[PDB]
Amino acid sequence: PTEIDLTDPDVYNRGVPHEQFAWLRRNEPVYWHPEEGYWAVTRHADVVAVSRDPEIFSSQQGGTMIQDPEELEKQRMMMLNMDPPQHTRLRKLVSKGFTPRMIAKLEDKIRERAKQIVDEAIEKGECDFVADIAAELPLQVIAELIGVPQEDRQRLFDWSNRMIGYDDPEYHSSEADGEQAAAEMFAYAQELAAERRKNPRDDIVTALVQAEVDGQKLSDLEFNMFFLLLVVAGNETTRNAISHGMLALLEHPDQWERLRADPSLAPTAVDEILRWASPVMSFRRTATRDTELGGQQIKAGDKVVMFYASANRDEEVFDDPYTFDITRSPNPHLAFGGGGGPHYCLGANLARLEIRVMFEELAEIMPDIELTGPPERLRSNFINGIKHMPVRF
Ligand code: HEM
Ligand SMILES: C=C1CC[C@H](O)C/C1=C/C=C1\CCC[C@]2(C)[C@@H]([C@H](C)CCCC(C)C)CC[C@@H]12
Ligand code: NA
Secondary structure, eight states, X not given: OOOOOTTOGGGGTTSOOHXXXXXHHHHOSEEEEXXXXXXEEOSHHHHHHHHTOTTTEESTTTOSOSOOOHHHHTTTTSGGGOOTTHHXXXXXXXXXXXXXXXXXXXXXXXXXXXXXXXXXXXXXXXXXXXXXXXTHHHHHHHHHHHTOOGGGHHHHHHXXXXXXXXXXXXXOSSTTHXXXXXXXXXXXXXXXXXXXXXXXXXXXXXXXXXXXXXXXXXXXXXXXXXXXXXXHHHHXXXXXHHHHHHHHHHHSHHHHHHHXXXXXXXXXXXXXXXXXXXXXXXXXXXXXXXXXXXXXXEOTTOEEEEEHHHHTTOTTTSSSTTSOOTTOOSOOOOTTOOTTOTTOOTTHHHHHHHHHHHHHHHHHHOOOOEESSOOEEOOOSSBOOEEEXXXXX
């Protein structure tokens, strides 16, 4: 196969290039793509090994985005781009509201919203599965969880689209759209923080302003950058799991029948949807010193790109990896990152709950859902996203 540039958004225009990943896994699983260049890491075990060693494979040294100085400095304030010990301290501060017990307290409220969202979509008849269902549930939930009034949730969605849509013409007008979105969101976040410091509420903003670990509290910039990451993660990952999951269910109709007949299949179905969609396709690291990975010699300063979508088709880990099987078990997919990595998704419990509740509700109402046209992909080299997906109920 020709040596495709996996950092180029256009190579994802016709979908995830799974044949390229399949050839790499079999023939060159740790592969130097020359240009500057980068190592493509495509096997599950090697993604896990890179993930769990931040001392060698740093997130701070070159950031975590896969394309090739002001950008790095303007984003080293993101928790994603920190290494221990800096990272360890920040993650201890912001994780309090995301433990499994805290998240499980939301199921009934999340189910109440999902039932109402599905009901209104069915009443409409013909709609956009993204705007009316897949994006709307995580949007309402993250607004309520953060503490943003429901009237303001559309501001959160528009900001988030501008933050990640920097390669898609529908979501960006030029290169500074995202920076301006961030400035607006920082001002909004600071207003909310000031209010909850004075008058605490049961929301994440209050949890964050009150948090204290080892004599430390969140600084202004730390708070603002974590608010930003929560809003973008809340709005640009789960909705694409739901959209690709619905598409997979319609295109593998036997699986949809099984789920409709047996709602107890939903927890395993969530993990197969996550393995299938792999909504976050890749993240980058930088080697801090000379090292060996999979018999390949990686030099200090080298860019290393972990392809979670390829890991989630690894024939050594998953039997029949190109089959969508909602009962697949076990299912050690890497959609949330390599297990053991210090940055492993902080919201994985919330994401699983949102996806589980939504598909339970779609399956129980038993509507006949059908596509009325092709879904439109987000242009991205990072997110495996669906912008629109016309359906009829
Ligand atoms: C399908 C949904 C999601 C997927 C596939 C996903 C994926 C990921 C991945 C791959 C990482 C980096 C892991 C690593 O580098 O080792 C990550 C980190 C993170 N995610 Fe998730 N995510 C999802 C939903 C969410 C949600 C809903 C939230 C919050 C409401 C969230 C919050 C975060 C945060 C704060 C981090 C940074 C953690 C750190 O740097 O220590 N994510 N996510
Ligand atoms: C930070 C600021 C705010 C200050 C400056 O505007 C620079 C900047 C960029 C933010 C970006 C760049 C693109 C990718 C980022 C970092 C998004 C990130 C990849 C989201 C990941 C979501 C989830 C998978 C964890 C969130 C914010 C985005
Ligand atoms: Na119908």
